[PDB]
Amino acid sequence: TQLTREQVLELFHQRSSTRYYDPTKKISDEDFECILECGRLSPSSVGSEPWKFLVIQNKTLREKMKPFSWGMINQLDNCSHLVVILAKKNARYDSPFFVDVMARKGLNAEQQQAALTKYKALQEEDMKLLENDRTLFDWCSKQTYIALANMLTGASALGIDSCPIEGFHYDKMNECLAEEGLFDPQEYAVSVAATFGYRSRDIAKKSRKGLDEVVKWVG
Amino acid sequence: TQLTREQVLELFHQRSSTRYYDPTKKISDEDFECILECGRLSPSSVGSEPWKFLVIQNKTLREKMKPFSWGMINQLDNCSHLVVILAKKNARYDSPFFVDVMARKGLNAEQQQAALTKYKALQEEDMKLLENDRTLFDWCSKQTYIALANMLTGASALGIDSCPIEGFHYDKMNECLAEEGLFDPQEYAVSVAATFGYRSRDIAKKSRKGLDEVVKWVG
Ligand SMILES: Cc1cc2nc3c(=O)[nH]c(=O)nc-3n(C[C@H](O)[C@H](O)[C@H](O)COP(=O)(O)O)c2cc1C
Ligand SMILES: Cc1cc2nc3c(=O)[nH]c(=O)nc-3n(C[C@H](O)[C@H](O)[C@H](O)COP(=O)(O)O)c2cc1C
Ligand SMILES: Cn1cncc1[N+](=O)[O-]
After folding, report:
1. Residue A126 contacts by C-beta under 8 Å, 6 or more apart in sequence?
2. CA–CA separation, B164 vs B196, rounded Å?
């Protein structure tokens, strides 16, 4: 809630991508719903919250993922928890989805007419999102990477390890989770995944480009 | 480094988007560098780190932004620090950019060949990123939203308020920054921005969809 600079830097050095989990250690129900709160509470362009979290604990569905999920093939066998983050498809400014967003903010017919104009200008001319489905979807998916990041960091502050995952066939992952009836494929699609658990190896050392290469100061 | 579930929950609850900053209060050099380290230390797909952070402290450059940055037009004057995050354009697997990525990990001719095969599978087959230029830029831009999230969370842990920013004309933010020589527009493009400072009003109440509609457990 309040940390020193030393405690902050150590929080982000200690967070590593964990490829090897101890299958004997499970995350408690309490710890993991806290990790999920970190995602839920995440900021979100125009409060859109365009995410759904699938917690994949069924072991046979994990096995069914392995043939197309080379980026996590062994982690699927040993991680405590697997989260697949979906992102909202077709989140147009004039959609029922954004009517839900305005309703959660209590906007009158006037404030709605102002908000929709702002949504429209953000989507249509600021960010050029309405070119095709993929560009609008990728806008929501970006918001979900905020939720992903916060879940990795909250987990690590709880002493729980994690690993973000893009290494899988996205079309096959979308099909397989839709055929289990886990989400409506016209409404949502897979954005990114993450495993969680307790590492079985030492933390690898951070390798990054230096601060002088990634930062540019304009005084 | 290690918090409790209540500590973690308030760390993410206490962060909110600040639209009103105290022009009298400035972030320390040491406090901000630690914020920037939270970004630098963020995870990224295949270690790509496809970001650059422009810290816009120049006051008259901030003024040029106001005509096309309605999302932050009040914050521009009073915020302590403004960061504009760029994402790499054309980060193709076979590009010089990924030679740097492989170099930073010290990969032999055989290890580079395996890594190149994995990057190609990821980009062409799994995520279908080579459809056009926007799909590939939007992938790198997603990674930058991880960096963005961690900087907001690091700020909040240091007592520093923040607001993430998409409310500007991207076309005109790009050209304004590129014509002033701050990045190469064929190599990078604006992804998202964020202000940092100390709030001048009260923290508004968190409003989020309930955990029971954003989470679906699969047993
Ligand atoms: C969105 C995203 C997707 C990633 N996908 C995978 C993956 O499928 N499998 C994996 O082992 N690592 C994956 N990584 C981890 C990166 O390779 C890792 O973040 C990077 O090499 C830096 O290492 P560090 O996170 O340990 O600091 C992914 C990272 C991100 C942010
Ligand atoms: C990527 C991103 C871009 C945003 N752009 C803006 C913006 O331009 N101006 C602004 O005032 N708020 C902006 N917001 C803030 C959101 O409106 C805010 O996160 C959301 O309404 C939830 O409120 P909270 O962050 O206070 O919890 C942005 C949020 C995100 C994550
Ligand atoms: C992204 N990805 C996919 N497979 C492996 C990775 N990695 O980040 O090393």
Report:
1. B166, B167, B168, B169, B170
2. 9
Whole-number Å distance between alpha carbons of B218 and B120? 32
Return the H-helix or E-strand segment holding A85.
strand A81-88
CA A9 to chain centre: 22
CATH topology for A5-214 is NADH Oxidase (3.40.109)
Q: N- to C-terminal Cα distance for chain B?
A: 32
At B148, which helix (H) or strand (E)? helix B133-157
CB atoms within 10 A of CB B118: 16
CA A217 to CA A212: how far, in whole Å?
9
Angle between helices A133-157 and B133-157 (to 10 degrees): 30
- Separation of CA B42 and ligand 1 centre (Å): 10
Select the residue from A17, A26, A32, A40 to test the B interface by mutation, using most B Cβ atoms within 10 A.
A40
Amino acid residing at A24: T
Whether residue B157 and residue A8 make contact (CB cut-off 8 A), yes or no, is yes
For chain B, domain boundaries: 5-214
Residue pointed to by tokens 């995350």: A27
**Nearest CA-CA partner of A62 in A41, A44, A47, A84:** A84
Residue with tokens 């521009």: B76
Write the CB contacts of A156 (distance below 8 Å, at least 6 apart in sequence): A11, A14, A15, A162
User: Which amino acid belongs to residue A70?
Assistant: W
**CA separation for the pair B130, B113 (Å, rounded):** 20
**Ligand with smallest separation from the Cα of B143:** 1
Q: What separation in Å is there between the alpha carbon of A211 and the centre of ligand 3?
A: 23
Retrieve residue B61's tokens.
Answer: 């450059």
3-state secondary structure of B170: helix
Which experimental approach was used here? X-ray
Q: Count of alpha carbons within 13 Å of A192, Cβ hemisphere only?
A: 28
Q: Which residues of A touch B171 (CB under 8 A)?
A: 128
Closest CA to A80 of A25, A19, A33: A25
